[PDB]
Amino acid sequence: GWVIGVNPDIGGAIAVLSPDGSSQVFDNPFVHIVVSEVIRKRLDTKSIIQLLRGLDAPPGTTAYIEKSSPFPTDGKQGWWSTGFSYGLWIASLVASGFSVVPIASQTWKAYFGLMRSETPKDDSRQAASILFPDKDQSLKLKKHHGRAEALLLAAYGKGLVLP
Amino acid sequence: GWVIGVNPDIGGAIAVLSPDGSSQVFDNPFVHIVVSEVIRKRLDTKSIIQLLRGLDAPPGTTAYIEKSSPFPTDGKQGWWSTGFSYGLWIASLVASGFSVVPIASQTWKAYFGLMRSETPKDDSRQAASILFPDKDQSLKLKKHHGRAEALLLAAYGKGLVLP
DNA sequence: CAATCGTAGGAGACCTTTGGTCTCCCTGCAGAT
DNA sequence: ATCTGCAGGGTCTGGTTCCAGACCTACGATTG
Ligand SMILES: [Mg+2]
Ligand SMILES: [Mg+2]
Numbered sequence: 189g190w191v192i193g194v195n196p197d198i199g200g201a202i203a204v205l206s207p208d209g210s211s212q213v214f215d216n217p218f219v220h221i222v223v224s225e226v227i228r229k230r231l232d233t234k235s236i237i238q239l240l241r242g243l244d245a246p247p248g249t250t251a252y253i254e255k256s257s258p259f260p261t262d263g264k265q266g267w268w269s270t271g272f273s274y275g276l277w278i279a280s281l282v283a284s285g286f287s288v289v290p291i292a293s294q295t296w297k298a299y300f301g302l303m304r305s306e307t308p309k310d311d312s313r314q315a316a317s318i319l320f321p322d323k324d325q326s327l328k329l330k331k332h333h334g335r336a337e338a339l340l341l342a343a344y345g346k347g348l349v350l351p
Numbered sequence: 352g353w354v355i356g357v358n359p360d361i362g363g364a365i366a367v368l369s370p371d372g373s374s375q376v377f378d379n380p381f382v383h384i385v386v387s388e389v390i391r392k393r394l395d396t397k398s399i400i401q402l403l404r405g406l407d408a409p410p411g412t413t414a415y416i417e418k419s420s421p422f423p424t425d426g427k428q429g430w431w432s433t434g435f436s437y438g439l440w441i442a443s444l445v446a447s448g449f450s451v452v453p454i455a456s457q458t459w460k461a462y463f464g465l466m467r468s469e470t471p472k473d474d475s476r477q478a479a480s481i482l483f484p485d486k487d488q489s490l491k492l493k494k495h496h497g498r499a500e501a502l503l504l505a506a507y508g509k510g511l512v513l514p
Numbered sequence: 515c516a517a518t519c520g521t522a523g524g525a526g527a528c529c530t531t532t533g534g535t536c537t538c539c540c541t542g543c544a545g546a547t
Numbered sequence: 548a549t550c551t552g553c554a555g556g557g558t559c560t561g562g563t564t565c566c567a568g569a570c571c572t573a574c575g576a577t578t579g
Contacts, residue, residue, distance in 0.1 A: 224558055229541095255525085257540085261554090262539080265541055265542070268433065271433070272434035272437060274435055275434070277442075279441075280442045282400055295526085303538085304537080329549070331548095392573095419571095419572085421557075423558090426522030428574065431524095432572075456559090460569085460570075461561090461569085
């Protein structure tokens with residue numbers, strides 16, 4: 189049936205797969221906010237809830253979400269932001285009636301044979317373009333790898349196979 | 352005029368103040384989760400949303416929430432968990448129809464004259480007991496300071512004053 | 515169960531398989547074209 | 548604007564133009 193895949197971080201996206209084969213992918217809504225006298229991007233909570241409420245996916249649809257797992261060498265702001273983005277998305281999905289299933293990036297990458305790639309973000313856009321050819325135009329920029337990763341997480345959840 | 356005050360961390364609480372002067376305070380629901388082969392406490396998303404849905408406070412009620420601000424010397428896990436709990440609560444409150452207003456701890460502490468105390472958690476329980484005497488029995492343990500801080504945040508938002 | 519103390523910390527999936535091995539980002543800021 | 552590269556970082560309020568002063572939290576463990 190329906191499958192949702194969420195790539196939750198600031199350059200992420202939510203992909204929605206319908207039973208008739210169609211797909212949608214939306215960039216994560218964000219806002220600019222002032223923190224410690226500089227500008228930071230933060231997810232836009234109201235817009236995410238509005239987006240989820242507008243989906244045709246019925247209550248109980250599984251929403252796969254990529255599990256938050258920053259490196260010990262990443263900065264503490266990286267740790268805070270990945271936690272924040274994860275919590276915001278999990279509560280939004282639960283409140284909107286979806287069944288949240290966290291998935292490690294290694295899981296869907298291994299499924300599509302994408303591990304240890306020299307060009308992982310390019311490879312993600314290529315794989316997503318082949319699985320979802322009507323999204324090829326929406327994946328033409330390097331910055332679209334977040335869209336590709338959400339689509340691939342959803343594709344994993346739906347059991348799709350590359351040709 | 353209803354007022355909600357949320358102390359969002361793992362030992363926190365949500366306080367609800369009604370226009371008739373009554374109050375409720377609920378410990379934050381949590382679950383035990385496995386992470387890196389050890390047990391960690393994490394907020395319980397479903398129980399938080401269920402709790403919010405059961406409140407009598409009408410949509411549009413303001414929910415003051417204590418702003419997340421860990422120290423630079425706190426560990427990266429502390430940074431992740433304060434971010435996660437903050438995001439989970441913000442999305443839960445917005446999805447439940449409440450108007451979220453972040454408040455720094457310094458703001459409500461200064462308002463009640465609590466800064467630079469030798470016993471800050473005891474003083475919070477004492478101040479909350481004086482503002483909400485029918486919660487005195489619910490504030491008598493040292494571990495109840497999370498409840499006290501949620502009540503004081505709500506009291507700040509309502510404009511209450513100590514005698 | 516409740517209180518207290520002290521430092522500030524990866525996490526996850528699958529193999530080699532009851533421990534071992536290998537994998538994975540993310541943010542924040544500056545720069546160039 | 549899009550991309551690229553590199554290191555891994557506090558933040559907030561009241562008082563102004565930056566300063567001064569203030570604030571936790573988590574994750575372990577132990578003791579009764
Ligand atoms: Mg991502
Ligand atoms: Mg707190």
